Amino acid sequence: LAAGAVILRRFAFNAAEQLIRDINDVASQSPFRQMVTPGGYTMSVAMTNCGHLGWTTHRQGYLYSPIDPQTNKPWPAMPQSFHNLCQRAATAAGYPDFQPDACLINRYAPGAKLSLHQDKDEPDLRAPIVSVSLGLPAIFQFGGLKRNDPLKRLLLEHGDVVVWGGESRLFYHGIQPLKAGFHPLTIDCRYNLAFRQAGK
Numbered sequence: 001l002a003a004g005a006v007i008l009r010r011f012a013f014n015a016a017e018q019l020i021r022d023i024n025d026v027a028s029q030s031p032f033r034q035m036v037t038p039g040g041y042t043m044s045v046a047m048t049n050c051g052h053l054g055w056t057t058h059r060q061g062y063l064y065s066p067i068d069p070q071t072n073k074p075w076p077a078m079p080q081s082f083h084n085l086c087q088r089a090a091t092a093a094g095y096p097d098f099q100p101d102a103c104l105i106n107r108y109a110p111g112a113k114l115s116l117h118q119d120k121d122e123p124d125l126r127a128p129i130v131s132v133s134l135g136l137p138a139i140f141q142f143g144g145l146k147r148n149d150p151l152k153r154l155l156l157e158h159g160d161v162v163v164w165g166g167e168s169r170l171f172y173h174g175i176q177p178l179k180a181g182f183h184p185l186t187i188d189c190r191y192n193l194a195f196r197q198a199g200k
């Protein structure tokens with residue numbers, strides 16, 4: 001895909017049913033919620049987290065916290081299925097030592113989008129992003145280090161895993177408004193699992 005980045009198409013297909021069961025379990029403790037940006041806007045993507053650290057919005061900016069600010073309880077632990085799939089994908093992608101401490105779970109309803117951004121809240125740039133697609137298909141934009149650097153547009157379908165790191169660790173990326181559709185395992189949405197090393 002780029003220097004240090006790869007798409008492992010359908011890599012998570014066999015694991016997907018189990019991953020979705022575990023999403024449901026995570027969400028039972030820390031429900032999906034549409035977070036409000038530091039600038040005051042409700043995101044169209046609904047999110048939750050598992051693992052030690054959860055990505056959250058705050059008045060002062062984006063940040064990681066071990067506490068879910070909605071439930072005021074810790075985030076649920078990382079499911080075994082998540083851990084195992086992430087490790088295998090990272091290894092296949094050339095990042096054998098990846099040990100995530102954070103998984104952001106994104107839910108896209110039809111029309112939901114995540115505009116171009118960098119994943120720039122993690123101090124240790126040696127660790128890649130491992131990004132798992134489940135359910136409805138989406139167009140993923142993958143750019144460069146500047147907002148106006150040319151974008152690649154890639155369809156991501158159920159089971160696809162994108163990994164970026166090294167040279168491409170800070171590349172701009174996003175998801176275009178989700179097209180309407182049906183998927184037998186997620187019904188009416190796309191999920192994304194975004195694994196990160198957010199701490200030291």
Ligand SMILES: O=C(O)CCC(=O)C(=O)O
Nearest residue numbers: 104106119131175192194
């Ligand atoms: O849904 C995706 O594939 C991308 C999500 C994303 O970029 C993020 O969680 O920062």
Ligand SMILES: [Co+2]
Nearest residue numbers: 117118119173
């Ligand atoms: Co991102």
